[PDB]
Short mmCIF file of C-alpha atoms in Angstrom, two decimals:
data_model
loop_
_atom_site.label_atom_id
_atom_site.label_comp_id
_atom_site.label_asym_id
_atom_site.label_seq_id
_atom_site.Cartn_x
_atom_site.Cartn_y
_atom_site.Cartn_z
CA UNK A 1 0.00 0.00 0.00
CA UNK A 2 2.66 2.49 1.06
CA UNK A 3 6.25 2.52 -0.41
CA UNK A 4 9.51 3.99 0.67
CA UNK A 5 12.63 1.91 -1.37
CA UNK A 6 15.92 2.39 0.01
CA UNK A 7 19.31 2.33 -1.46
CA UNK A 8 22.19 1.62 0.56
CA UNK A 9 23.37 5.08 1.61
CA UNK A 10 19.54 6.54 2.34
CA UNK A 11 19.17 2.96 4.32
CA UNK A 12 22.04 3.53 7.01
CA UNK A 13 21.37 7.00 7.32
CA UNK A 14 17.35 6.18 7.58
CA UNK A 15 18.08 3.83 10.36
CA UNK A 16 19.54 6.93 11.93
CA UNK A 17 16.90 9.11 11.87
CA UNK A 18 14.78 8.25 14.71
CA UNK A 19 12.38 11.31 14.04
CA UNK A 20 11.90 10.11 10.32
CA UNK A 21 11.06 6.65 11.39
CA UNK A 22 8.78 7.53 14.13
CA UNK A 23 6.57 9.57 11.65
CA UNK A 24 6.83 7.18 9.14
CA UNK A 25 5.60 4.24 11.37
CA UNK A 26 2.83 6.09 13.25
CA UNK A 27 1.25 6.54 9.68
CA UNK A 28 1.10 3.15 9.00
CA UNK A 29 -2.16 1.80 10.10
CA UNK A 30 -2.39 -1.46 12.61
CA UNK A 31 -4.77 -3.49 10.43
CA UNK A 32 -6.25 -5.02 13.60
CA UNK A 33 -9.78 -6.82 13.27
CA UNK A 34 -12.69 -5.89 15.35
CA UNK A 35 -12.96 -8.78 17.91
CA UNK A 36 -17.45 -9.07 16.63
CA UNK A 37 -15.62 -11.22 13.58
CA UNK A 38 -15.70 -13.62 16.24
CA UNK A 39 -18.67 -13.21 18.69
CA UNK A 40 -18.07 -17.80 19.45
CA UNK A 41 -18.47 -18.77 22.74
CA UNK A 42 -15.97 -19.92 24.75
CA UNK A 43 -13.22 -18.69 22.00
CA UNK A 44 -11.14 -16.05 24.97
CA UNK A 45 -9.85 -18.95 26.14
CA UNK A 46 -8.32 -20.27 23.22
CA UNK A 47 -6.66 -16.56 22.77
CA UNK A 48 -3.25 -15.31 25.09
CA UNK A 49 -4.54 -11.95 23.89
CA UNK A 50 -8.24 -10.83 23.51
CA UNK A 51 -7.66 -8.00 21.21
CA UNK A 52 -4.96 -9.74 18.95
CA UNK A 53 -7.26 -12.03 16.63
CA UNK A 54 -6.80 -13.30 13.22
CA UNK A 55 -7.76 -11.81 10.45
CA UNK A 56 -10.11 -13.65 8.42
CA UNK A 57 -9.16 -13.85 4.97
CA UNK A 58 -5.82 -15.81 5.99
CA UNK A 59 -6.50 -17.11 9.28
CA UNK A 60 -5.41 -20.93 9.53
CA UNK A 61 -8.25 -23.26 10.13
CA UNK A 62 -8.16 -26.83 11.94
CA UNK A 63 -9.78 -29.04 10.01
CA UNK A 64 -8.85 -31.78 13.10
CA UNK A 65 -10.43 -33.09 15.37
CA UNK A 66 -14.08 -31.16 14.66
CA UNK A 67 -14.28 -29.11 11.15
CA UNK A 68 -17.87 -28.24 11.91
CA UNK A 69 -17.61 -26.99 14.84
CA UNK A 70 -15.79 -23.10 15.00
CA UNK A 71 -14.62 -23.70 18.59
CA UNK A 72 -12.21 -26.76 17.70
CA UNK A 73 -11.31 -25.49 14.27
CA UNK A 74 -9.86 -22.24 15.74
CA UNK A 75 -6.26 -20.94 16.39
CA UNK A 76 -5.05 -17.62 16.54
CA UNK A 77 -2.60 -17.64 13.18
CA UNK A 78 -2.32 -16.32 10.14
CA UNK A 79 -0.53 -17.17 6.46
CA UNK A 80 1.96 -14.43 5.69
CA UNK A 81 2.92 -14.11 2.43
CA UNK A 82 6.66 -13.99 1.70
CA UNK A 83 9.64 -11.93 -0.79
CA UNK A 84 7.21 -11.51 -3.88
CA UNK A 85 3.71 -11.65 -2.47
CA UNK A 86 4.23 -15.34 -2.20
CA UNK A 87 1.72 -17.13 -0.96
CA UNK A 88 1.88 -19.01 2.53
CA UNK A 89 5.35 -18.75 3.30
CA UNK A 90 5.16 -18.49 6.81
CA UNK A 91 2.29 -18.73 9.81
CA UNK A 92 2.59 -16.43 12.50
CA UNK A 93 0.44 -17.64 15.47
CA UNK A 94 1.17 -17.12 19.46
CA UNK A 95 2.94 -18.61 21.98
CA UNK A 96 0.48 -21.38 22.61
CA UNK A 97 -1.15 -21.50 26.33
CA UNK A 98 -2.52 -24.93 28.03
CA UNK A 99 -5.15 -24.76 26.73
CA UNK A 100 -4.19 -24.81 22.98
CA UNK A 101 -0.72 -26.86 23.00
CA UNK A 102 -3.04 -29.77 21.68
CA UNK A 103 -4.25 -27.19 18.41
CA UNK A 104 -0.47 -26.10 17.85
CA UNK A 105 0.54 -29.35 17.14
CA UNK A 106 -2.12 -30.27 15.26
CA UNK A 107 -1.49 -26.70 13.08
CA UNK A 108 1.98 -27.97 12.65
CA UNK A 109 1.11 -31.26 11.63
CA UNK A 110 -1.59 -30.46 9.26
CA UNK A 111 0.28 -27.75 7.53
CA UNK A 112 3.76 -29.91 7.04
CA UNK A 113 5.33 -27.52 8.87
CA UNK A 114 9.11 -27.99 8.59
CA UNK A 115 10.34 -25.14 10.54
CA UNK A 116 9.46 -23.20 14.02
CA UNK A 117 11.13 -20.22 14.99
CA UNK A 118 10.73 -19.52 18.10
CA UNK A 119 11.77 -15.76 19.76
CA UNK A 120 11.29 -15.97 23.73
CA UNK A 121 13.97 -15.04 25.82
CA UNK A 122 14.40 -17.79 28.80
CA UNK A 123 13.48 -15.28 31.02
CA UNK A 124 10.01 -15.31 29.64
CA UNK A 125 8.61 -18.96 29.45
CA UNK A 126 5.41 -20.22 30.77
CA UNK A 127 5.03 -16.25 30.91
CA UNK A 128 5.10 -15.53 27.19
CA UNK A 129 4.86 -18.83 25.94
CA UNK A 130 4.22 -22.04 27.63
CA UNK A 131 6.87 -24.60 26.81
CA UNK A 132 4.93 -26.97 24.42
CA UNK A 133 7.35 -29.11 23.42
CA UNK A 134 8.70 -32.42 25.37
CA UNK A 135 11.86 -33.66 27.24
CA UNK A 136 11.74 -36.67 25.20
CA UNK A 137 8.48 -37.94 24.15
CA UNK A 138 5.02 -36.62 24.11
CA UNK A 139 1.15 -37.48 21.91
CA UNK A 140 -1.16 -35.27 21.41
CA UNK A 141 -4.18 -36.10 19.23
CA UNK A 142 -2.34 -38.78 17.62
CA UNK A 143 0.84 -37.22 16.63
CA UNK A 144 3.72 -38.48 18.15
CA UNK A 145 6.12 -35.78 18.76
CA UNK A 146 9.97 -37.01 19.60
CA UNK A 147 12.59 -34.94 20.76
CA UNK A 148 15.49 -36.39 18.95
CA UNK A 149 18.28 -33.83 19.89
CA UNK A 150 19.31 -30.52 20.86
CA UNK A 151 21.83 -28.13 19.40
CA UNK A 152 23.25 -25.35 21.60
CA UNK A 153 24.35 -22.49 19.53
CA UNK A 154 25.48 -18.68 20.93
CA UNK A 155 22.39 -17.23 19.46
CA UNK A 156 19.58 -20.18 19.68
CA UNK A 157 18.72 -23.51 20.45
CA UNK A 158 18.02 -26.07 17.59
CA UNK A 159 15.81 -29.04 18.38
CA UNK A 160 15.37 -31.77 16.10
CA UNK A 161 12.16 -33.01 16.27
CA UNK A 162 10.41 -36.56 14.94
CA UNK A 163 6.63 -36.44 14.39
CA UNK A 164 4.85 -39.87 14.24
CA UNK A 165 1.16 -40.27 13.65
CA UNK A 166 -0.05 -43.82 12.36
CA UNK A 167 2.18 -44.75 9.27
CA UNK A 168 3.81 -41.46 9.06
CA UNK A 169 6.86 -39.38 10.24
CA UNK A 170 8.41 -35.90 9.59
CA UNK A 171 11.26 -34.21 10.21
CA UNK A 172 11.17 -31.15 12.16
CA UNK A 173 13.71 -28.21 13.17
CA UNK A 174 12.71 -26.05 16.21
CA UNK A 175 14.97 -22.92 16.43
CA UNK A 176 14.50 -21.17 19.74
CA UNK A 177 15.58 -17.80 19.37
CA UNK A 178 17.05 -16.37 23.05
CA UNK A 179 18.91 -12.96 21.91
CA UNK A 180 16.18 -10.95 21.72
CA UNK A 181 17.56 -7.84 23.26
CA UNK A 182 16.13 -5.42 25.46
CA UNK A 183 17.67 -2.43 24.13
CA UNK A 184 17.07 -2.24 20.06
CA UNK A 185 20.54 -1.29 19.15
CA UNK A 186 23.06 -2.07 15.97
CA UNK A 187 25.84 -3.74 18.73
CA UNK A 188 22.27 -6.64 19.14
CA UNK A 189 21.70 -6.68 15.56
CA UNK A 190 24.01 -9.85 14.45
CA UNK A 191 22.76 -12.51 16.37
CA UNK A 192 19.35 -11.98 14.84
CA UNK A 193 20.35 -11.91 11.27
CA UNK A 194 22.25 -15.36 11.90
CA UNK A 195 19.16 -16.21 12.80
CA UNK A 196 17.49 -15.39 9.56
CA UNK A 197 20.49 -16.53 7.50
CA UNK A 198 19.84 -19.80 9.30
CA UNK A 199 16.27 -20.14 8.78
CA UNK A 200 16.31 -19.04 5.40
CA UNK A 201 19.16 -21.78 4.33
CA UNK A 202 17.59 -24.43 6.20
CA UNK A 203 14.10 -23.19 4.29
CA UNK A 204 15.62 -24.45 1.13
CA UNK A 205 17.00 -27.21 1.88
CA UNK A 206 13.92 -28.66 2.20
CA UNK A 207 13.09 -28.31 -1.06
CA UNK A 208 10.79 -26.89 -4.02
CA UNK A 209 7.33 -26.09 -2.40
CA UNK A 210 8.46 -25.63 1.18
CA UNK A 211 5.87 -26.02 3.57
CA UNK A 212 4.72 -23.19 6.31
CA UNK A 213 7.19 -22.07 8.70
CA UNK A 214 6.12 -21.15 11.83
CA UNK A 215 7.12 -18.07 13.66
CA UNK A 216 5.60 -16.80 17.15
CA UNK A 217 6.83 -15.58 20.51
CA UNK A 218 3.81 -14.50 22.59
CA UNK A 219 1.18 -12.17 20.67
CA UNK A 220 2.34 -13.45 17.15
CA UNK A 221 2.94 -9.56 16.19
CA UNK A 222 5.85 -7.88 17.51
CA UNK A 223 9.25 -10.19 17.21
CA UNK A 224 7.27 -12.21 14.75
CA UNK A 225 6.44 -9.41 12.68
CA UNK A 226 10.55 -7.98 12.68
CA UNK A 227 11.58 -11.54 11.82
CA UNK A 228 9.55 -12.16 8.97
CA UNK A 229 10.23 -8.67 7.67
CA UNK A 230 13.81 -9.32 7.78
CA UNK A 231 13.42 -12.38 6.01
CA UNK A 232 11.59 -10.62 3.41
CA UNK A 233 14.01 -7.86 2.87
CA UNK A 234 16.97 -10.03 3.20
CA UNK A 235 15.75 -11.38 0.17
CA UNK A 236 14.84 -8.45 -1.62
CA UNK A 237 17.96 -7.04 -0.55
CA UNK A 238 19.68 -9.93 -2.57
CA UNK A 239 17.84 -9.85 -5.39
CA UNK A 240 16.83 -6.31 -6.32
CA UNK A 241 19.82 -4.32 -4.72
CA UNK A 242 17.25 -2.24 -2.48
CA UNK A 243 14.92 -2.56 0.46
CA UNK A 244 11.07 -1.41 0.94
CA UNK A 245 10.67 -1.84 4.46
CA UNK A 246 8.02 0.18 4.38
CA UNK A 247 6.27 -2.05 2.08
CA UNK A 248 6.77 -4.93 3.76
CA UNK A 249 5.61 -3.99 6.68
CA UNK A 250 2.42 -2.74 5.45
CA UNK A 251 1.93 -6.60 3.34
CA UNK A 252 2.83 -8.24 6.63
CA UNK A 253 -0.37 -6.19 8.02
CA UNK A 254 -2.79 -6.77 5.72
CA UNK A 255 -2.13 -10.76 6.30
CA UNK A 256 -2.45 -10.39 10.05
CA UNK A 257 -2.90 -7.21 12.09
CA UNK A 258 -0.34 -5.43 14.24
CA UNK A 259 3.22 -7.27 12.67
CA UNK A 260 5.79 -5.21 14.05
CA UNK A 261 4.08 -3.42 17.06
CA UNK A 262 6.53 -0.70 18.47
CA UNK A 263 8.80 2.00 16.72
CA UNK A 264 11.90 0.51 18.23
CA UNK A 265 11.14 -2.44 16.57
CA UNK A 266 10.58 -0.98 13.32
CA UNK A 267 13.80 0.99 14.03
CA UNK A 268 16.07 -2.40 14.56
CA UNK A 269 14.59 -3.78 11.47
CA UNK A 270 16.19 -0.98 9.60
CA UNK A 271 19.43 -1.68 11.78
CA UNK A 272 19.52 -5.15 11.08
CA UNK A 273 19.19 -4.65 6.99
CA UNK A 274 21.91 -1.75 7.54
CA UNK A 275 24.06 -4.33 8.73
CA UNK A 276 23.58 -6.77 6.28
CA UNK A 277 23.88 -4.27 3.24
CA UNK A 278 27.34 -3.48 4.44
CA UNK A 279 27.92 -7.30 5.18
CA UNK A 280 27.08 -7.74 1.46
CA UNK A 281 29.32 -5.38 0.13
CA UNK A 282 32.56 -7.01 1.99
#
């Protein structure tokens, strides 16, 4: 809808400009949908935030274990579209609660997910996310989900997951994200864009016609939303020699409201693209 491209001089400097960014962002509108789209009963409790819903046209819908009924076929997630306007790249959903671990799972496993990224700071569990995920083994629904091994990196955690259900099994790769800094500055930009750089390169190694991945920390908006973007504009970046971050952030709204929620997180966005442009030019 909007549009601001940036080449790589106007990008560093842009990231500078605080008062530039602030009136540029405060413009942009949140996209958030009016919580009568879904006057269900009993549906707060399958929500971490009331206000923070799914927008309808790409909201992700359970088809297991009820498809007629709206209660069981609910979760609070949308399909974002990726670099391109391509369709379904990624779900952004929250940080599950009790009482919709069960759904998650059954999101991940009827989508194919290959890929969670996860970005909750240790700090923050079973505060902003409840820890969903086993020691070793755990079933929900059907779906056997095996924790096969765990990968300590600086930056994140990798978990490689097995997911049985009948006759079936998938591979899975959980990336748990635990850098996310406090203070939005360039020095806490890096670990992030590994991040990204890891994602995306693990992305295609799966293969044409990758599958969903998964992104959330609590609300599905904030993080989610700056991760996403910089996927997006890591690619663009690559291809077309610029970077719309405007426009990316305003296609990340219109697929599910609120992506990128505060100014200093639009802010480090443009820090962690200024970063990589200079990375890219050795």
């Amino acid at each position: 809808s909007m549009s601001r491209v940036l080449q790589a001089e106007e990008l560093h400097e842009k990231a500078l400009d605080p008062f530039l960014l602030q009136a540029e962002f405060f413009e942009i509108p949140m996209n958030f949908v009016d919580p009568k789209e879904y006057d269900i009963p009993g549906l707060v409790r399958k929500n971490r935030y009331k206000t923070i819903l799914p927008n309808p046209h790409s909201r992700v819908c359970l088809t297991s274990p009820d498809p007629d009924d709206p209660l069981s076929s609910y979760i609070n997630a949308n399909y974002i579209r990726g670099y391109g306007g391509e369709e379904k790249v990624y779900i952004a959903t929250q940080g599950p609660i009790v009482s919709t671990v069960a759904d998650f799972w059954r999101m991940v496993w009827q989508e194919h997910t290959p890929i969670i990224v996860m970005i909750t700071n240790i700090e923050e569990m079973n505060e902003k996310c409840t820890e969903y995920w086993p020691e070793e083994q755990v079933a929900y629904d059907g779906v056997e989900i095996t924790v096969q091994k765990v990968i300590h990196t600086e930056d994140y955690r990798l978990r490689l997951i097995s997911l049985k259900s009948g006759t079936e099994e998938r591979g899975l790769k959980h990336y748990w994200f635990t850098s996310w800094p406090d203070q939005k500055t360039p020095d806490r930009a890096p670990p992030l864009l590994h991040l990204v750089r890891e994602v995306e390169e693990a992305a295609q190694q799966e293969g044409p016609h990758c599958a969903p991945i998964i992104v959330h920390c609590s609300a599905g908006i904030g993080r989610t939303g700056c991760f996403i973007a910089t996927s997006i504009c890591c690619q663009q970046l690559r291809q077309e020699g610029v970077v719309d971050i405007l426009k990316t952030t305003c296609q990340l709204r219109q697929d599910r409201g609120g992506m990128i929620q505060t100014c200093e997180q639009y802010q480090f966005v443009h820090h962690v693209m200024s970063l990589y442009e200079k990375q890219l030019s050795h």
